[PDB]
Amino acid sequence: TIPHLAIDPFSLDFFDDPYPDQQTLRDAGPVVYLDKWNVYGVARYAEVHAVLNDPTTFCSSRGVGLSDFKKEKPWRPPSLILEADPPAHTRPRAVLSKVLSPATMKTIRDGFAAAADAKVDELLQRGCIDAIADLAEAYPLSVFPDAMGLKQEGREHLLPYAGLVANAFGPPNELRQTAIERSAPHQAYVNEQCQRPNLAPGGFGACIHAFTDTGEITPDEAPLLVRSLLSAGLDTTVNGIGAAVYCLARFPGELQRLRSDPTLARNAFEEAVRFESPVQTFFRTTTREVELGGAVIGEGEKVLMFLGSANRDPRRWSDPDLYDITRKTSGHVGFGSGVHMCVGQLVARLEGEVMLSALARKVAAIDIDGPVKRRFNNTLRGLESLPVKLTPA
Ligand code: HEM
Ligand SMILES: CCc1ccc(C(=O)O)cc1
Ligand SMILES: [Cl-]
Numbered sequence: 001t002i003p004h005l006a007i008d009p010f011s012l013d014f015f016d017d018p019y020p021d022q023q024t025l026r027d028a029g030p031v032v033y034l035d036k037w038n039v040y041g042v043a044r045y046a047e048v049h050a051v052l053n054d055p056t057t058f059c060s061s062r063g064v065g066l067s068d069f070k071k072e073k074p075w076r077p078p079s080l081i082l083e084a085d086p087p088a089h090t091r092p093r094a095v096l097s098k099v100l101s102p103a104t105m106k107t108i109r110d111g112f113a114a115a116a117d118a119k120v121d122e123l124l125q126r127g128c129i130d131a132i133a134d135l136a137e138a139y140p141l142s143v144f145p146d147a148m149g150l151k152q153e154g155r156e157h158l159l160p161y162a163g164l165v166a167n168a169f170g171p172p173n174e175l176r177q178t179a180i181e182r183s184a185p186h187q188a189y190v191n192e193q194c195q196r197p198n199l200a201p202g203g204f205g206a207c208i209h210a211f212t213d214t215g216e217i218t219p220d221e222a223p224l225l226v227r228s229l230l231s232a233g234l235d236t237t238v239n240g241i242g243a244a245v246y247c248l249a250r251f252p253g254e255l256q257r258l259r260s261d262p263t264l265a266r267n268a269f270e271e272a273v274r275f276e277s278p279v280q281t282f283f284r285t286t287t288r289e290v291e292l293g294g295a296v297i298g299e300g301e302k303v304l305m306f307l308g309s310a311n312r313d314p315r316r317w318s319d320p321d322l323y324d325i326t327r328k329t330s331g332h333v334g335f336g337s338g339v340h341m342c343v344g345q346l347v348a349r350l351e352g353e354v355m356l357s358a359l360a361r362k363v364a365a366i367d368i369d370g371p372v373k374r375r376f377n378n379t380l381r382g383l384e385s386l387p388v389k390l391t392p393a
Helices: 012-016 019-027 045-052 090-099 102-126 132-148 155-168 174-180 184-193 204-214 222-232 235-250 252-260 262-276 345-362
Strands: 032-034 039-042 128-130 281-286 290-292 295-297 302-306 363-368 373-376 381-385 387-392
Touching: 012 373, 039 045, 045 290, 045 302, 090 204, 090 222, 102 128, 102 132, 102 345, 102 387, 128 132, 132 155, 132 204, 132 222, 132 235, 132 345, 132 381, 155 174, 155 184, 155 222, 155 235, 184 222, 204 222, 235 252, 235 262, 235 345, 235 363, 235 381, 252 262, 252 345, 252 363, 262 345, 345 363
Parallel strands: 039 302
Antiparallel strands: 032 039, 128 387, 281 302, 290 295, 363 387, 373 381
């Protein structure tokens, strides 16, 4: 009753161009079995949304990667929030939602907006830049480690650790193997920065430790929650800003609408998160036998959610393959949906908005003028190099 496909969603061929296979995954049926990794897959919007909004049946405490924590030991101690179900998830989640609250965004908006405007002006002096290294990476690296309260020493480990975390969500293919092997220096730096004496007062990390006074988390939970911000709060914003720049470089008409109305900067970033979906996939594990799309999935089964495919499903989105900055983007699952929906979404939107705002007010054109290279990661979709020429406004 369930179609069996041999497509490998974690293959280099797939990462290179996933859209044809994603339609094959969608049109084969609302639920598919992937023989390559012995998992269930859902690729349409309706099933991804339902699975994401049924945490009692599709749990996250047995891992959000392929590995089943009930079966194998995790490569690192489980995340107290991402790899937790309610009610264990609730109080650590409330702490991160307060640390990264709308009220906190007021304290960092001027610094983030200034750094964004300064970087675009700096890049306009050089003309021909790499939108990844010199823009997508340089800007988050210039605001987020300081907002965490991180010291200067050892920041070179932040991006390699983030790519390791994202790779480790995938199957035991070469990409995961080479990430985990000899990863101990990346882990030691991160785990050391998660301790209270290494976080500047007033930063996200110190503010987390400050919530141990409240009884929401214990002092020994706070470092793990700091690790969560250091695993997810940098690499994804990089790919997201690079995607937006990629779109504005591929859709020059949408760049011109953004110039004529910079207040579209925030929704233009949101649409870039739908269009490229930097977090492509996540896993759930069935708590019980469950009917999904006419298929009976047993207990203890891994279910793979194609977030990116759900954001391009023509059953839900009109013209899904077009970048449209005025599109009503609410309901896209680029940040998740439900109880685990990205608790850091306000930081990513803020970083994205002020960058696209900076581009909207200072740049006339963005033309690709060099070899484009894709970056391969079992979870993330993003570019290795995006050579563009910026024309000043
Ligand atoms: C373009 C940027 C980002 C994207 C596309 C993204 C994507 C996601 C997605 C899809 C989830 C759902 C995980 C699941 O349901 O299993 C998630 C959760 C999470 N994200 Fe983000 N993220 C982004 C940026 C950030 C930032 C900036 C932070 C922190 C500053 C962050 C921290 C987290 C955390 C801690 C969780 C776990 C929430 C929970 O389990 O309740 N992410 N993210
Ligand atoms: C969405 C990517 C992500 C990765 C790791 C964590 C965590 O460490 O809790 C949270 C989110
Ligand atoms: Cl670690």
